[PDB]
Design an enzyme around this catalytic site. Structure first.
Site, mmCIF file in Angstrom:
data_model
loop_
_atom_site.group_PDB
_atom_site.id
_atom_site.type_symbol
_atom_site.label_atom_id
_atom_site.label_comp_id
_atom_site.label_asym_id
_atom_site.label_seq_id
_atom_site.Cartn_x
_atom_site.Cartn_y
_atom_site.Cartn_z
ATOM 1 N N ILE A 1 0.814 -1.236 0.084
ATOM 2 C CA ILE A 1 -0.050 0.096 -0.021
ATOM 3 C C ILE A 1 0.757 1.311 -0.294
ATOM 4 O O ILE A 1 0.689 2.418 -0.137
ATOM 5 C CB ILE A 1 -0.866 0.041 1.763
ATOM 6 C CG1 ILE A 1 -0.289 -0.254 2.427
ATOM 7 C CG2 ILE A 1 -1.806 -0.825 1.024
ATOM 8 C CD1 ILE A 1 -0.916 0.210 3.684
ATOM 9 N N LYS B 1 4.930 -2.822 8.639
ATOM 10 C CA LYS B 1 6.165 -1.092 7.783
ATOM 11 C C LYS B 1 7.049 -2.375 7.913
ATOM 12 O O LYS B 1 7.717 -2.075 8.990
ATOM 13 C CB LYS B 1 5.959 -0.966 8.750
ATOM 14 C CG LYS B 1 7.223 0.633 8.355
ATOM 15 C CD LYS B 1 6.834 1.922 8.886
ATOM 16 C CE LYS B 1 8.280 2.609 7.575
ATOM 17 N NZ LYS B 1 8.381 2.494 6.949
ATOM 18 N N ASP C 1 8.527 15.786 10.187
ATOM 19 C CA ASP C 1 8.267 16.234 8.897
ATOM 20 C C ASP C 1 6.522 15.927 8.761
ATOM 21 O O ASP C 1 5.956 14.621 8.943
ATOM 22 C CB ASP C 1 8.367 14.722 7.982
ATOM 23 C CG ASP C 1 8.205 12.912 8.748
ATOM 24 O OD1 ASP C 1 8.200 13.018 9.766
ATOM 25 O OD2 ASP C 1 8.265 12.201 8.037
#
Length: 658
Positions: A196, A219, A316
């Site tokens: 994904i 992940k 970020d």
């Protein structure tokens, strides 16, 4: 799209939607609880670290469930107390005074007034008078019954908790805790679906945990790539941050449940935000409007507040990093570049061009959580304009965007209301000392801004507001697996992982207790409990009919007992599983169950130490005279407690004999 991509998407979607009404049916593997004899070891293991206190167990999800179901079914005296506590907790979650009025009157009549009339009320006059004074004035705050909560906990802490500990349901708690502490995840445990996303050191795949069926986002970081780009420090820092922010209850951050590594991959297991990131939805839907961006700004502000309270700076912050859940509520996802500024304020220019604070972009100058507010301003500007306040990538060169350090934000008068103009002017201030959120209380300075004057932050935390956008339920909400692509395997050629490199990740694997317990409670707690109960009923009937009971009173002075595998015989079965009893002077040993017999005397022991055999942890006992024994346990907690107790036993016996 080609047939293979369509099939992958359909399989992923069906696995995501399968048996939504019956989550227990989604599990393909089954959790096998240990035998009820486990409590003899697990009780000592938990006592040795003070984990069998009332607060520790009652604050755990599975411990609370077992204690509640014990009180409601096996102790009449405690039944009204637990019922009262549970209904108080239910009342605390009522969101309107119109409903809280009736709920509180019902609770009062049911659990206070009737007992007062019968003079059976055990609670103190103070709580009664407090509740009466609040109710006579028509006040129904959520904290109405807090004194009653405290007094109920005080009453349960007494003989009720001791009876629970002596009961057979504390044995079930010990079994579940042993299952928890023996989590050793591998890539086999998960059913990995299509990719994904991709970036950083690896890729993100949706996956279903085999033994519970809960959908997760796995992940994966490649160890070879990490070594190639000297990212070991970043890889470990990501785990530190994920474990730092996951411990809690904030619904605005993608929490981590487990962390593990294969010989070549580092893997984090995270919440699955199947709605997709906010950048994809922005591209599909176009620029949002101010009332729509109110929702996202409020949620992201609460998330940043949760992170900043822990002294983590989210460097970020982009729309791409904001993930929409199934219903449309957003969460902050990528903690790859997050840092901690409590020990020392960072000074590296880490971020994404167009969203980095001027002090972050400046070289050498230290910065604090102040960076996240400038990035929040830039992000909110993009949601309303489709690009950062400074030129986009296709509009200017990267360093031309960096001229953000030599200008001031445009602050358009057209697409922004005056309140939003003030908000963005505050968030995009060049001077940190003057920037909004960088002075005073921090998150409060923004939360109280005029742009959020109409917003009730309690409802934001409760997530009562309707999301502006609800992701489609029939799509993956991500780019095609062909578009996402994959890293070049040739780039890793020439990279070899030394034993000194695998040592960096010796302590990497992790499991978070509350997250696993919540998952189990949601998915397979009741099913497993019922199956387990049937199994012990069957075995108890078998033992009663055929004799050879589980234990004959566990001796007279047994320190501890449990299954262990007498190991290492070449001429017999290697795994000679047997039942052991520990006494202050000797360690006995039992066969299939007919009659225990002595295996060892503590006075003979020379030393006890751990050893690795067949890539499995084991216990090694060396004996005066050259003899030795090897024992192998089933759960790390059994091994730890057996080591500790054998060591203490022989040390004490020989010191006394000295």
């Amino acid at each position: 799209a080609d047939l293979e991509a369509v099939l992958a998407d359909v399989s992923y979607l069906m696995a995501m939607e399968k048996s939504k009404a019956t989550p227990a049916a989604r599990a393909s593997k089954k959790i096998l609880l240990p035998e009820p004899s486990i409590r003899s070891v697990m009780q000592k293991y938990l006592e040795d670290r003070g984990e069998v206190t009332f607060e520790k167990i009652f604050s755990q999800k599975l411990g609370y469930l077992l204690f509640r179901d014990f009180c409601l079914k096996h102790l009449e005296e405690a039944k009204p107390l637990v019922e009262f506590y549970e209904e108080i907790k239910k009342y605390e979650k009522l969101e309107t005074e119109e409903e809280r009025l009736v709920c509180s009157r019902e609770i009062f009549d049911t659990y206070i007034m009737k007992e007062l009339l019968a003079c059976s009320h055990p609670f103190s006059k103070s709580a009664i008078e407090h509740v009466q004074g609040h109710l006579v004035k028509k006040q129904v705050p959520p904290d109405l019954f807090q004194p009653y909560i405290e007094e109920i906990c005080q009453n349960l802490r007494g003989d009720v908790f001791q009876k629970f500990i002596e009961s057979d349901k504390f044995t079930r708690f010990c079994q579940w805790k042993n299952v928890e502490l023996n989590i050793h995840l591998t890539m086999n445990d998960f059913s990995v679906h299509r990719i994904i996303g991709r970036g950083g050191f690896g890729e993100v795949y949706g996956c279903r945990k085999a033994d519970t069926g809960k959908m997760y986002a796995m992940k994966c970081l490649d160890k070879k790539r990490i070594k190639m780009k000297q990212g070991e420090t970043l890889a470990l820092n990501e785990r530190i941050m994920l474990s730092l922010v996951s411990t809690g209850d904030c619904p605005f951050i993608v929490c981590m449940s487990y962390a593990f590594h294969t010989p070549d991959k580092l893997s984090f297991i995270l919440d699955l935000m199947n709605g997709g990131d906010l950048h994809y939805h922005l591209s599909q839907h176009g620029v949002f409007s101010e009332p729509d961006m109110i929702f996202y700004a409020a949620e992201i502000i609460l998330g940043l507040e949760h992170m900043h309270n822990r002294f983590v700076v989210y460097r970020d912050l982009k729309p791409a990093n904001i993930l929409l859940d199934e219903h449309g509520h957003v969460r902050i996802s990528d903690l790859g570049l997050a840092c901690d500024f409590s020990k020392k304020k960072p000074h590296a220019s880490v971020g994404t061009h167009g969203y980095m604070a001027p002090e972050v972009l400046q070289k050498g100058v230290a910065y604090d959580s102040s960076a996240d507010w400038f990035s929040l301003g830039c992000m909110l500007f993009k949601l309303l304009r489709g690009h950062s306040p400074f030129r986009q990538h296709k509009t200017k060169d990267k360093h031309e965007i960096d001229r953000m350090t030599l200008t001031m934000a445009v602050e358009l008068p057209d697409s922004f209301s005056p309140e939003l103009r003030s908000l963005l002017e505050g968030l995009l201030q060049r001077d940190v000392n003057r920037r909004l959120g960088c002075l005073g209380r921090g998150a409060q300075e923004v939360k109280e801004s005029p742009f959020f004057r109409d917003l009730d932050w309690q409802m934001v935390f409760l997530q009562k507001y309707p999301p502006p956008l609800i992701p489609p339920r029939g799509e993956v909400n991500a780019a095609d697996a062909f578009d996402i692509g994959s890293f070049d395997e040739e780039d890793t050629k020439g990279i070899k992982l030394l034993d000194s490199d695998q040592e960096l990740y010796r302590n990497f694997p992790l499991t978070i207790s509350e997250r696993w317990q919540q998952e189990v409670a949601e998915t397979v707690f009741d099913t497993i409990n019922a199956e387990t109960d049937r199994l012990e009923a069957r075995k108890k009937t078998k033992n009663k009919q055929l004799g050879h009971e589980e234990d004959y009173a566990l001796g007279k002075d047994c320190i501890m007992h449990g299954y262990m595998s007498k190991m290492g015989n070449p001429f017999l079965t290697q795994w000679q599983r047997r039942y052991f009893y520990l006494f202050p002077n000797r360690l006995e040993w039992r066969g299939e169950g007919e009659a225990p017999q002595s295996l060892l005397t503590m006075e003979e022991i020379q030393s006890v130490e751990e050893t690795q055999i067949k890539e499995r942890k084991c216990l090694l006992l060396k004996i005066r005279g050259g003899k030795q024994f090897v024992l192998q346990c089933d759960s790390d907690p059994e091994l730890v407690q057996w080591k500790k107790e054998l060591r203490d036993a022989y040390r004490e016996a020989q010191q006394l004999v000295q």
